[PDB]
Design a protein. Structure first.
Lengths: 95, 144
């Protein structure tokens, strides 16, 4: 339960994590020359969506990060747990 | 029609070369075109009167691809190669990225609805059976 906010290991994932896109980004530029060379575009004009795809990588990191701060750092479940305990009267004695 | 342009250009060079060349000389050099041009005319004339639409043009030339003049046959064949490029181009997507890209024209494919073959338009030389495989691949990619 307390494994997710490691913080010190979170950093290593990132250089590896953004280096991993570099590998597609490395082939894509050269292959962009091949795609450009082939019939102007070998694939349909709409295929250019492949070039903007890396954005997702940043998106994943953003969401996961927010969750830990919102959850373990801020111990949110406890706030829901107490609200249930006192406002919905789960705790028997207090009610 | 490009070679006709080159030929006319060349004649001038000879006239520049010599100041007195008979018209008959002109008749001889341009007389290979005297026959190809009338023929290509009907290929277009059919297109305008019948309001041939979309791929149906691909067949209209192909039926005149059986022409009894060897030059005309080679001449028209070049055009079909050019036109196929687009068809190959539109088929390059529906089969691949599962999306039709057509406004008013068609590539013989009209979810699991709005997507079906147009028998009228289908070119004859392409067999109906292969078209079904194509339809299957595009619908297949579209669903997943």
């Amino acid at each position: 339960m307390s494994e997710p906010p490691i913080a010190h290991l979170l950093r290593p994932v990132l250089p590896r994590a953004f280096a991993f896109p570099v590998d597609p980004q490395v082939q894509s530029a050269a292959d962009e020359t091949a795609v450009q060379l082939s019939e102007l575009l070998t694939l349909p004009v709409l295929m250019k969506r492949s070039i903007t795809a890396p954005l997702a990588a940043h998106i994943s990191l953003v969401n996961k990060a927010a969750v830990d701060y919102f959850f373990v750092e801020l111990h949110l479940e406890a706030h829901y747990e107490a609200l249930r305990h006192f406002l919905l009267m789960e705790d028997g004695e207090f009610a | 029609l490009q070679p006709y342009r080159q030929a006319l250009l060349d004649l001038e060079q000879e006239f520049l070369g010599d100041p007195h060349l008979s018209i008959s000389h002109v008749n001889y050099f341009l007389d290979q075109f005297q026959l190809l041009f009338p023929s290509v005319m009907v290929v277009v004339e059919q297109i305008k009167s019948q309001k041939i639409h979309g791929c149906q043009i691909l067949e209209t030339v192909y039926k005149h691809s059986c022409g009894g003049l060897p030059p005309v046959r080679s001449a028209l064949e070049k055009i079909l190669a050019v036109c196929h490029g687009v068809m190959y181009k539109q088929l390059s997507a529906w089969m691949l990225h599962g999306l039709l890209l057509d406004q008013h024209e068609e590539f013989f494919i009209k979810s699991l609805k709005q997507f079906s073959l147009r028998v009228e338009i289908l070119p004859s030389y392409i067999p109906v059976r292969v078209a079904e495989k194509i339809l299957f691949v595009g619908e297949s990619v579209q669903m997943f």
